[PDB]
Write an enzyme that holds these catalytic residues in place. Structure first.
Site, short mmCIF file in Angstrom:
data_model
loop_
_atom_site.label_atom_id
_atom_site.label_comp_id
_atom_site.label_asym_id
_atom_site.label_seq_id
_atom_site.Cartn_x
_atom_site.Cartn_y
_atom_site.Cartn_z
N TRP A 49 -26.40 32.33 7.23
CA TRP A 49 -24.91 32.45 6.14
C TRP A 49 -23.94 31.79 7.03
O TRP A 49 -24.02 31.79 8.02
CB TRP A 49 -24.75 33.75 5.39
N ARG A 70 -26.71 35.92 16.38
CA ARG A 70 -27.99 36.35 16.79
C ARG A 70 -28.10 37.87 16.57
O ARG A 70 -29.45 38.31 16.83
CB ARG A 70 -28.18 36.05 18.21
N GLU A 116 -16.55 27.73 10.03
CA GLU A 116 -17.08 26.59 9.79
C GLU A 116 -16.88 25.74 8.77
O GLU A 116 -16.61 24.39 8.86
CB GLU A 116 -18.62 27.03 9.70
N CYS A 143 -25.55 30.21 19.27
CA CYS A 143 -25.39 31.19 17.81
C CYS A 143 -24.78 32.38 18.18
O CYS A 143 -25.30 33.23 18.94
CB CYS A 143 -26.91 31.25 17.52
C1 HEM Z 1 -27.57 35.12 9.72
C2 HEM Z 1 -26.27 34.47 9.73
C3 HEM Z 1 -25.94 33.43 10.97
C4 HEM Z 1 -24.50 32.90 11.25
C5 HEM Z 1 -23.05 33.73 10.72
C6 HEM Z 1 -24.74 32.10 12.27
C7 HEM Z 1 -23.59 31.63 12.99
C8 HEM Z 1 -23.47 30.38 13.65
C9 HEM Z 1 -22.56 29.50 14.02
C10 HEM Z 1 -21.06 29.65 13.61
C11 HEM Z 1 -22.99 28.49 14.73
C12 HEM Z 1 -22.07 27.37 15.55
C13 HEM Z 1 -22.46 26.09 14.27
C14 HEM Z 1 -21.66 24.96 14.78
O1 HEM Z 1 -20.24 25.22 15.18
O2 HEM Z 1 -21.94 23.68 14.44
C15 HEM Z 1 -24.40 28.59 14.92
C16 HEM Z 1 -25.35 27.69 15.66
C17 HEM Z 1 -26.61 27.66 15.71
N1 HEM Z 1 -27.44 28.74 15.11
FE1 HEM Z 1 -26.74 30.40 13.93
N2 HEM Z 1 -26.05 31.73 12.46
C18 HEM Z 1 -26.87 32.44 11.66
C19 HEM Z 1 -28.17 32.27 11.65
C20 HEM Z 1 -28.99 31.39 12.41
C21 HEM Z 1 -30.40 31.21 12.24
C22 HEM Z 1 -31.24 32.17 10.81
C23 HEM Z 1 -30.72 30.42 13.05
C24 HEM Z 1 -32.31 29.75 13.23
C25 HEM Z 1 -33.43 30.60 12.81
C26 HEM Z 1 -29.75 30.12 13.81
C27 HEM Z 1 -29.84 29.02 14.97
C28 HEM Z 1 -28.59 28.57 15.43
C29 HEM Z 1 -28.97 27.53 16.46
C30 HEM Z 1 -30.10 27.04 17.06
C31 HEM Z 1 -27.29 27.22 16.36
C32 HEM Z 1 -26.76 25.84 17.72
C33 HEM Z 1 -26.88 24.52 16.77
C34 HEM Z 1 -26.38 23.49 17.56
O3 HEM Z 1 -26.37 23.47 18.92
O4 HEM Z 1 -26.01 22.39 16.95
N3 HEM Z 1 -28.74 30.72 13.48
N4 HEM Z 1 -24.72 29.91 14.49
C1 LIG Z 2 -24.84 18.31 17.85
C2 LIG Z 2 -23.66 17.87 17.23
C3 LIG Z 2 -22.80 16.80 17.83
C4 LIG Z 2 -21.63 16.40 17.31
N1 LIG Z 2 -21.12 16.84 16.10
C5 LIG Z 2 -21.94 17.88 15.45
C6 LIG Z 2 -23.24 18.42 16.06
C7 LIG Z 2 -24.03 19.39 15.09
C8 LIG Z 2 -23.34 20.55 15.12
C9 LIG Z 2 -23.99 21.53 14.03
N2 LIG Z 2 -24.36 22.83 14.28
C10 LIG Z 2 -24.54 23.03 13.02
C11 LIG Z 2 -25.22 24.41 12.68
C12 LIG Z 2 -26.44 25.07 13.26
C13 LIG Z 2 -27.04 26.22 13.11
C14 LIG Z 2 -26.20 27.28 12.20
C15 LIG Z 2 -26.66 28.33 11.97
C16 LIG Z 2 -25.86 29.30 11.10
C17 LIG Z 2 -24.76 28.62 10.41
N3 LIG Z 2 -23.85 29.49 9.84
N4 LIG Z 2 -24.19 27.39 10.91
C18 LIG Z 2 -25.08 26.64 11.59
C19 LIG Z 2 -24.44 25.28 11.88
#
Ligand code: HEM
Ligand SMILES: Cc1ccncc1CCCNCc1ccc2ccc(N)nc2c1
Ligand code: HEM
Ligand SMILES: Cc1ccncc1CCCNCc1ccc2ccc(N)nc2c1
Ligand SMILES: C[C@H](O)[C@H](O)[C@H]1CNc2nc(N)[nH]c(=O)c2N1
Ligand SMILES: C[C@H](O)[C@H](O)[C@H]1CNc2nc(N)[nH]c(=O)c2N1
Ligand SMILES: OC[C@@H](O)[C@@H](O)[C@H](O)[C@H](O)CO
Ligand SMILES: OC[C@@H](O)[C@@H](O)[C@H](O)[C@H](O)CO
Ligand SMILES: [Zn+2]
Lengths: 407, 411
Positions: B280, B111, B285, B108
């Protein structure tokens, strides 16, 4: 123990078995991944020779042949007596091609089998090295129709008689720190440039001065040589739509020729092994030109385009970046100097990867390096899972010779 | 043990000690790196050390380590575990845990915001109708008329694995996809399977290009039920370009609230299988992945044609050119409608500052470079040049299998 890689755009799954042959360590552990870190005796020698000879002889459908057993015997006999051994010409060529084939950071490996190998093991002096390098440059350049090549100097003996090319690439631009505090030329090359000056190079203090060669033969002190200007093909950079772009004064050289790596084959070490292919456009347009610690031209280009540089969200940097890269590709193509764009290159790598899985059981690949530094996910490699592991023969990094050299 | 990371653009070197607290495995070994691999019922046995590790962390964080309150809480949890085979977190512990799972999420880039997270405790929920109400409230709170607020809603933890709460949607708001008899896809190809499930469960599909999917909600291990999010709660943004007037006629829009609903939240050995959370968007994305992935909306060509780029050779970089313009439009549209969004330059700049602060104050910041670097213009963002160390800390967000693959149907 049998590993699967998936492509997330096509759903194609490939199975890797080649990794089980791996011998060197990654830097990663079960508790920590170091995938993004840039730099993570007769008894030692024979298993390495054996391992290499086994794969060599397997490659020519003569595994378990008398010729194989005889060769193994002879090398073994030579190690016991001389403490080292000499590669046959066939083995050296195979080894060099396979070091490239094994280079997990190289996107251009579909070309691996088409490599011209210049055997320079008979070289004894730095004037000799200079002659060999000029010949490599001319052959590789081929008037703009580039041909991959490697020149191989004598192998390490006791470590005090090392052949080294001190330059990081055969052709590269000087860097000078200014009193006005800025940097003139290529910031990447300030320290090496200064070393040239200490050793006597009379610098022209320009922005694009082709550095001289600093050549070290037989562990002796290194000497300066200037590459014939007529052998250095360079490309003035213009844009096919922006008439003002040529006024930036930009140019780059045609031949990417890396000269500071170490080639390991069958336990033998070749500390001087300059090699060359041709450029992927992003190396110049994204990294050389737009890195903040390199020529860093984004601001200037952005201004000439009259972009709104007030806010990041206007993506003015991204717009300028694309245009710079359009110009690089346009300029090389217009002058008929081989270059490949990041789309064609990565598309080729995917096909190469599929060939290698099909014919070799895998292809070690470093995703962090394979994905281009712009437009990552619109290239097919972004969506391709890759396994990174170390196979030999290999190209390795080695310390810069000045930190090591007993003057 | 100390590990150093270097930024190759600034020469700033950081030292990591936090990785020493890592417990879970990465997938890598000394012989192979699996850094680019996407995806590389608990006994009282294993449970108490997990609870104890967590409570030690919680009590240290509130500067009460070794206190009587700390000791009493450990005792209380041990007794609850040995008598009921599980335990219940206090509200304070739950909030701390959810915030840390986010703080620990190595993939993420957002963070820097981790400590600002509204936690909704939904552990008293018993039915899918109850889940629907909680989820509507989350969407309305989080949306805040475009002034997005990060939030997470937490449903009851797993017990025997046969009474799981699950949200079957991958995100709370997402567009349907429909496979056509001619092999073409209408709407979002990423959601074709889930769309078919909804339709099978009784959803009447409009069959448009941007149909908001119904929620499919599973409470207490029962069969899932369909609900429609009130349209007035679903904030959407029509996509237009600031210079190109034809862009609006592409007919594009997107939703404002990215709300991931298929992850598992682990805190102190407890497993929260339904924990929808939202922040947000970072512009890429939508503009890079949702719009331009070949396997998603795939709009690059149509945009490139409309710009009249030379599309006969890739070397003209027509794709790179259209990609930038599309991403300009997404940012422009969200900002124009006053819906929170962040560009990839700002987001990565903030992440570097966050990471450096974490190194100083916490001893490290686990980060997955493969995911942190944006899918366009990678090396002109500072994260490209930053070495990162990836390791797993708990509390954590984890992947779990899709519920349709594991669910035991009641009928
Ligand atoms: C507040 C604004 C936030 C922004 C701009 C942001 C941004 C991002 C982005 C761009 C990704 C990559 C997602 C993808 O390519 O699928 C990501 C992944 C992730 N985010 Fe954040 N995020 C935010 C908030 C949060 C919050 C509130 C949480 C949890 C409470 C969080 C937890 C995660 C997790 C666990 C991933 C990994 C998802 C995965 O492995 O599929 N994010 N974030
Ligand atoms: C695990 C997998 C494997 C193949 N294709 C797609 C995926 C899932 C990727 C989805 N990640 C979505 C995601 C998770 C958390 C977010 C938090 C904030 C944000 N702006 N975007 C997020 C977007
Ligand atoms: C023929 C066309 C070739 C192309 C298009 C190509 C492309 C590339 C690119 C883009 C990189 C990344 C370099 C960087 O970002 O600094 C790279 C790395 C590398 N290439 Fe190739 N290459 C070619 C030929 C070769 C040849 C002939 C060899 C050796 C015989 C080779 C060996 C390597 C090695 C060892 C690396 C890793 C360098 C490092 O770790 O610093 N390449 N290649
Ligand atoms: C590893 C490192 C550490 C510090 N600074 C800079 C670096 C980058 C090393 C440079 N590698 C450049 C290189 C190597 C081989 C190539 C082969 C073909 C090609 N077109 N380009 C290449 C470019
Ligand atoms: C820190 C990170 O490993 C470093 O910036 C890498 C990223 N990927 C790269 N990829 C290539 N091809 N070349 C590079 O120099 C780098 N640098
Ligand atoms: C194969 C590769 O790991 C996969 O395509 C990853 C690359 N990096 C990513 N990074 C982000 N933020 N999101 C993704 O979905 C992916 N996909
Ligand atoms: O100025 C000297 C540098 O160019 C040199 O040390 C290189 O960065 C090094 O060889 C790594 O490529
Ligand atoms: O159509 C179903 C998909 O949306 C679903 O399988 C997701 O890809 C999965 O939940 C991972 O996010
Ligand atoms: Zn790894």
């Amino acid at each position: 123990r049998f590993l699967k890689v998936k492509n997330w755009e096509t759903d194609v799954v490939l199975t890797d078995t080649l990794h089980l042959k791996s011998t060197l360590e990654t830097g990663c552990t079960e508790h920590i991944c170091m995938g993004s870190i840039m730099l993570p005796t007769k008894d030692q020698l024979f298993p390495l020779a054996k391992e290499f000879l086994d794969q060599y002889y397997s490659s020519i459908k003569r595994f378990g042949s008398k010729a194989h057993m005889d060769r193994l015997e002879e090398v073994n006999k030579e190690i016991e007596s001389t403490s080292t051994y000499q590669l046959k010409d066939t083995e050296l060529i195979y080894g060099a091609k396979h070091a490239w084939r094994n280079a997990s950071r190289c996107v251009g490996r579909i070309q691996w089998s088409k490599l011209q190998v210049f055997d320079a093991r008979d070289c004894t002096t730095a004037h000799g090295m200079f002659n060999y390098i000029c010949n490599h440059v001319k052959y590789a350049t081929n008037k703009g129709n580039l041909r991959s090549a490697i020149t191989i100097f004598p192998q390490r003996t006791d470590g005090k008689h090392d052949f080294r090319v001190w330059n990081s690439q055969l052709i590269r631009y000087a860097g000078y720190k200014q009193p006005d505090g800025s940097t003139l030329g290529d910031p990447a090359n300030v320290q090496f440039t200064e070393i040239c000056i200490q050793q006597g190079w009379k610098a022209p203090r320009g922005r694009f001065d082709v550095l001289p060669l600093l050549l070290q033969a037989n562990g002796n002190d290194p000497e300066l040589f200037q590459i014939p200007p007529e052998l250095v093909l360079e490309v003035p950079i213009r844009h096919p739509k922006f008439d003002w772009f040529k006024d930036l004064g930009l140019k780059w050289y045609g031949l990417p020729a890396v000269s500071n790596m170490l080639l390991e084959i069958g336990g033998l070490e070749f500390s001087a092994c300059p090699f060359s292919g041709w450029y992927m456009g992003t190396e110049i347009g994204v990294r050389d030109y737009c890195d903040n610690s390199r020529y860093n031209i984004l601001e200037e280009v952005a201004k000439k385009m009259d972009l709104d540089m007030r806010k990041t969200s206007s993506l003015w940097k991204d717009q300028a970046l694309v245009e710079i890269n359009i110009a690089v590709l346009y300029s090389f193509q217009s002058d008929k100097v081989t270059i490949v764009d990041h789309h064609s290159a990565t598309e080729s790598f995917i096909k190469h990867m599929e060939n290698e899985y099909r014919c070799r059981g895998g292809c070690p690949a470093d995703w962090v390096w394979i994905v281009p530094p712009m437009s990552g996910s619109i290239t097919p490699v972004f969506h391709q899972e890759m396994l990174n592991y170390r196979l030999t023969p290999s190209f390795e990094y080695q310390p810069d010779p000045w930190n090591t050299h007993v003057w």
